[PDB]
C-alpha cells in the first residue's frame, strides 16, 4: 500500500492489480477542471501506478484493461493534483500513467520526493513539487517552497517522459538520466503561480545548492535557482565534503 | 602577439602595455552600430585585453589610464563583433574589458574557442560563437554553426561576467565555474538570427554531446541542444570512453 488516500472528501479510491500496480480512481474534477486528490502516503513501486482519467473502458499500459472511472461524471480532469498532506516523503520507483484523457499531473509533497526509475505516461506536463499547493477562496492559486529545505532527489535510474517536466523544490540532487520534452527546474524558497511563474523568493537561512550528475535529453532545459549564496553544481557521481 | 588584426579595412589597431595587456582600438562602428573587427588570430593571455570603446580618456581596469579611441568619431559602438577569419582557434586565458561605453560583445571563431580563466568586464552581453557571422547586403543577419563539429571549451579556471552570456557552438565541454547574469547555451548545428533566435537546425553526421562539470552561478540558465541523437552530459571531472 504505497498510496494511502486521505479519509476526507478529496481522498480518491485506490486498489491494486496483479503484479502490484496501483490504480487510483481520482476524485471528480471541480469547476477549474482540477481533480484535487489528497493522500496520507504517495509512493510508487517498481510495478507503477495508474491514475484513472478515463470516460470509457480501455487499455492501460501499466495495468492492462481497465474500466472507466465512475467518479468522473462525463468530464475528465484537466489537471490531476496529488497532494501529500502528512509528513511522509514520497518515493517514486516506477512509472505513473494517466489512463484515458491526457492531463496535466502534479505531485506535491513538502517532505521530499525521490524519483528513481520513475516516469510519466500520457501527461502533457508533469510537475514534482517539494512544497505545498496554495488555495484561496477554494481555488488553486499556486505553490510554495518557502521555509523548506527538503530535497527533490532523482536517482541513478532516472526519470522519463515525453511531456513537459517541472522540477520544483528548495534543492535538487539528480544522479541519472532525465528525459522530457522540456525540463524546467526552479529551485530555492519561492512562491509560484499555478503556471509556475516565480512570484516571490526568500533568502534561505543556509545554502540551497542543487547538484546534477548524469544526463539530460530534452528540447529545452531551464534552471533557475533563486537562493542567494547558492548555485548549481555539476559534479560527478559523488559530491564529497 | 596573441591578437593579430586582418590587414584589410576591418582590421583594428592593436598594441600592448606593460605586463602584456593588449589594447584594441576597434574600428569605427557602421550604421547598425556594429564595430566589425576582423582578425587572423584572436587570443588573450593571462594579462587580458581591452577593447577601446571610449570617447574620452579614462581608467581601464586591466590596462590603467588610456586615451580615447580616435577611430570612433563621436559615436561609440553598440555591438563589438570580433570575427576570426583564418583557420586558427582562439584561446582566452584572461579577462576582456570594454573600456568606455558599455557594449555588447561577440567573438566568433568557427575553428574553436577555449576559455580558461576568462571573463568579460563592462559588457551588457557577451557571446562566444564557434561559428561564423552571416552577412547579406552588407548587414549582419545572424550566425551559423552549420557543418561544424568544433568545440567551445571552458577550462577549470572558469568564466566570469556580470552581464548576459551566450555560449553558441556545435558542442561545449565545460569543466569550471561559469558566472553570469544569465547563461544561454545553444548547441548543435544551427543558423541563428542576430538575436540568437534559432532559425534552422541540421542533423549532424555524428553525435554532438555537450559536457558540463563544475558549477553555474547565474540568475537563469537555459540550454538547448538541437542535435538529434545527442544530449547534455553532466559528468565528473573526467569523461572516459
UniProtKB/Swiss-Prot annotation, chains A, B:
Compartments where found: Cell outer membrane
Cystine connections: none
Annotated function: Bacterial hemolysins are exotoxins that attack blood cell membranes and cause cell rupture by mechanisms not clearly defined. Cell-bound hemolysin, which releases heme-iron from erythrocytes by interaction with the erythrocyte membrane. HpmA requires HpmB function.
Note: The conserved amphipathic domains in ShlA and HpmA may be responsible for pore formation.
Protein name (record): Hemolysin
Amino acid at each position: 500500500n504505497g498510496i494511502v488516500p486521505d479519509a476526507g472528501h478529496q481522498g480518491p479510491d485506490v486498489s491494486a492489480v496483479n503484479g502490484g500496480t496501483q490504480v487510483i480512481n481520482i476524485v471528480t474534477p471541480n469547476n477549474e477542471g482540477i481533480s484535487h486528490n489528497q493522500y496520507q502516503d504517495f509512493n510508487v513501486g517498481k510495478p507503477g501506478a495508474v491514475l484513472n482519467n478515463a470516460l470509457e473502458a480501455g487499455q492501460s499500459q501499466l495495468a492492462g484493461h481497465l474500466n472507466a472511472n465512475s467518479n468522473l461524471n462525463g468530464q475528465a480532469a484537466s489537471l490531476i493534483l496529488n497532494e501529500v498532506v502528512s509528513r511522509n516523503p514520497s518515493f517514486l520507483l516506477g512509472q505513473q500513467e494517466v489512463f484515458g484523457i491526457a492531463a496535466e499531473y502534479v505531485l506535491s509533497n513538502p517532505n521530499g520526493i525521490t524519483c528513481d526509475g520513475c516516469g510519466f505516461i500520457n501527461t502533457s506536463r508533469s510537475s514534482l513539487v517539494v512544497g505545498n499547493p496554495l488555495f484561496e477562496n477554494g481555488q488553486l492559486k499556486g505553490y510554495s517552497t518557502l521555509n523548506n529545505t527538503n530535497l527533490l532527489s532523482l536517482g541513478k535510474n532516472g526519470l522519463n517522459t515525453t511531456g513537459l517536466l517541472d522540477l520544483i523544490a528548495p534543492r535538487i540532487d539528480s544522479r541519472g538520466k532525465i528525459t522530457a520534452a522540456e525540463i524546467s527546474a526552479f529551485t530555492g524558497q519561492n512562491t509560484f503561480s499555478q503556471h509556475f511563474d516565480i512570484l516571490s523568493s526568500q533568502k534561505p537561512v543556509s545554502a540551497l545548492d542543487s547538484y546534477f550528475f548524469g544526463s539530460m535529453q530534452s528540447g529545452r532545459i531551464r534552471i533557475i535557482n533563486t537562493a542567494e549564496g547558492s548555485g548549481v553544481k555539476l559534479a560527478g557521481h559523488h559530491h564529497h565534503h
